[PDB]
Amino acid sequence: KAFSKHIYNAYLKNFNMTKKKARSILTPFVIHDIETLWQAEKYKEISVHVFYRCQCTTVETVRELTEFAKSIPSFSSLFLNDQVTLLKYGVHEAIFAMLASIVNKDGLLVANGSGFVTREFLRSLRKPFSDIIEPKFEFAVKFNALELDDSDLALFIAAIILCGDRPGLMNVPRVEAIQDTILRALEFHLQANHPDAQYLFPKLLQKMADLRQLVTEHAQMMQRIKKTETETSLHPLLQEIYK
Amino acid sequence: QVADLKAFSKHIYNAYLKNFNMTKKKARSILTGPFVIHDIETLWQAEKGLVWYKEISVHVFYRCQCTTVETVRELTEFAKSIPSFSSLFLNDQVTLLKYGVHEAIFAMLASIVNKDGLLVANGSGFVTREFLRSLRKPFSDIIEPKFEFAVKFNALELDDSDLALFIAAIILCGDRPGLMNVPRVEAIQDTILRALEFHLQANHPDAQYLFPKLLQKMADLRQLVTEHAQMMQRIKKTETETSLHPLLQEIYK
Ligand SMILES: Cc1cnc(-c2ccc(-c3ccco3)cc2)n1Cc1ccccc1OCCCCCC(=O)O
Numbered sequence: 424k425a426f427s428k429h430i431y432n433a434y435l436k437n438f439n440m441t442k443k444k445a446r447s448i449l450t451p452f453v454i455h456d457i458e459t460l461w462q463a464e465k466y467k468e469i470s471v472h473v474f475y476r477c478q479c480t481t482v483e484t485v486r487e488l489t490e491f492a493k494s495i496p497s498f499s500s501l502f503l504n505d506q507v508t509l510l511k512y513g514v515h516e517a518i519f520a521m522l523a524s525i526v527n528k529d530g531l532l533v534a535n536g537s538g539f540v541t542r543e544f545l546r547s548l549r550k551p552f553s554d555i556i557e558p559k560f561e562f563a564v565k566f567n568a569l570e571l572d573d574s575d576l577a578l579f580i581a582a583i584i585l586c587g588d589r590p591g592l593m594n595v596p597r598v599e600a601i602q603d604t605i606l607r608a609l610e611f612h613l614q615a616n617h618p619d620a621q622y623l624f625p626k627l628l629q630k631m632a633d634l635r636q637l638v639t640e641h642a643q644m645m646q647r648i649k650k651t652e653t654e655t656s657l658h659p660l661l662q663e664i665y666k
Numbered sequence: 667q668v669a670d671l672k673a674f675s676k677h678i679y680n681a682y683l684k685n686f687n688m689t690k691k692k693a694r695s696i697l698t699g700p701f702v703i704h705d706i707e708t709l710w711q712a713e714k715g716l717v718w719y720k721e722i723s724v725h726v727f728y729r730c731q732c733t734t735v736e737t738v739r740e741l742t743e744f745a746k747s748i749p750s751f752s753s754l755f756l757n758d759q760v761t762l763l764k765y766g767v768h769e770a771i772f773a774m775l776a777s778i779v780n781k782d783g784l785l786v787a788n789g790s791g792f793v794t795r796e797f798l799r800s801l802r803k804p805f806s807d808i809i810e811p812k813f814e815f816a817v818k819f820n821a822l823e824l825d826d827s828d829l830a831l832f833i834a835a836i837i838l839c840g841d842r843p844g845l846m847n848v849p850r851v852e853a854i855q856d857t858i859l860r861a862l863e864f865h866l867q868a869n870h871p872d873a874q875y876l877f878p879k880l881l882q883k884m885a886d887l888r889q890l891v892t893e894h895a896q897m898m899q900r901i902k903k904t905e906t907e908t909s910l911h912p913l914l915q916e917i918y919k
């Protein structure tokens with residue numbers, strides 16, 4: 424409860440764009456095509472260009488999630504090396520869980536909420552830049568059906584970072600014990616914050632396995648791009664993660 | 667990295683302090699200043715007042731067996747708090763323990779040994795090596811090479827904190843037969859061995875060559891245990907009325 428307050432507080436300190444802020448906008452400049460895209464920017468091609476904007480957004484979200492993890496209690500007392508592994512395998516599951524907050528069925532907020540880019544447009548991109556995008560929308564649309572708010576998400580995101588099964592963890596039991604607290608606070612929080620909704624906690628535990636699968640298939644698609652899109656550059660911060 | 671290695675060592679040392687009833691520090695204070703057992707008479711006096719059948723050589727062998735079963739139990743609890751030991755496959759745990767306990771047991775046995783004998787029954791007995799030599803073959807023979815190993819090992823003057831990491835390196839051995847995730851085991855061992863190199867510079871700053879010296883003792887320990895296991899084979903073969911504890915049967919199987 425206090426613990427949940429504190430993670431919420433940390434979430435607010437660290438993420439410029441909260442679901443709260445995002446929902447109030449979604450109910451910005453549309454970008455539904457080439458002309459609109461080009462106007463918004465007022466190079467290789469439109470697709471690789473959109474991909475570079477994805478990369479720019481992911482990079483920044485890694486930075487935020489990195490500062491955020493510093494506030495999850497005991498995270499800072501893990502081996503430095505365990506910290507890095509937790510961040511490495513988890514940031515993308517967190518990044519895709521938080522994507523739901525800025526997405527609706529028709530598209531997503533960009534540039535701090537000033538823009539909206541239609542899901543139509545992103546589908547129009549040539550393969551495989553279309554295929555790496557659309558599966559996130561399918562996930563985000565369902566996730567949003569759970570109607571979580573920011574306070575819930577702050578715990579959700581922390582539970583994802585503190586996952587016991589990452590490859591190469593030295594102290595699994597310690598990481599697991601921190602997560603178990605996070606998961607307990609989260610159950611407690613959902614009872615209190617969503618008391619008439621029913622079965623939310625284990626629906627959320629399932630979403631965590633849905634994301635793990637989503638990031639598997641994303642990593643899968645990224646390495647295909649790493650080869651087949653010979654001329655497409657990848658931010659070095661994103662090279663370590665995919666290494 | 668440097669700060670993680672320190673903390674990893676400290677974790678291994680705490681696991682050690684919590685799991686072994688007898689540390690070298692305690693053993694050394696007892697040895698330097700128990701009831702001395704040096705003959706049949708003092709032996710029987712001990713089974714009557716140091717409480718903790720067939721013939722003397724076999725009775726001694728049984729007590730050797732009771733103590734090693736107990737140390738195997740402590741080593742299993744110890745390994746449970748070696749960081750990453752408990753999230754290995756359950757079959758890798760059992761395998762690491764089955765092939766490594768004896769190496770760990772004869773490493774640590776140096777802690778409770780001097781050239782004249784060793785502590786028994788948590789430091790309340792001392793059995794002289796002369797008495798153990800006087801036992802009949804093959805029992806006297808399975809004993810004396812551990813003393814020879816222990817005397818030279820003690821000359822390296824390790825302490826508990828060094829030993830905790832040395833023992834962990836013996837348990838987390840990548841080379842044991844029939845492991846499922848060899849690369850994972852090898853990764854933990856390498857981390858243990860880096861932590862060890864670092865801890866020795868810090869704990870033994872004037873000792874030249876101490877780390878490669880310990881890698882060699884690890885080689886010598888493997889040969890000692892091979893030789894030990896051949897002898898246990900010969901005893902199973904030739905001493906038919908002598909029994910072996912079922913925990914030890916599983917290991918030797
Ligand atoms: C998570 C996110 C947040 N914001 C954006 C975003 C930003 C600006 C644009 C835009 C389009 C036209 C101009 O700008 C599109 C998406 N994304 C990206 C994204 C949203 C939905 C589905 C999939 C996505 O990325 C998949 C590729 C990520 C590659 C790098 C990596 O693996 O790390």
Ligand SMILES: Cc1cnc(-c2ccc(-c3ccco3)cc2)n1Cc1ccccc1OCCCCCC(=O)O
Nearest residue numbers: 726729730731733734771775786793808809812813914
């Ligand atoms: C490791 C240890 C620790 N303490 C003792 C100990 C205990 C009590 C007596 C005692 C003699 C009279 C009354 O009690 C002697 C030795 N040992 C045993 C031992 C110490 C030195 C050399 C060899 C040894 O074992 C040889 C047989 C091991 C068989 C079991 C197996 O393979 O697993």
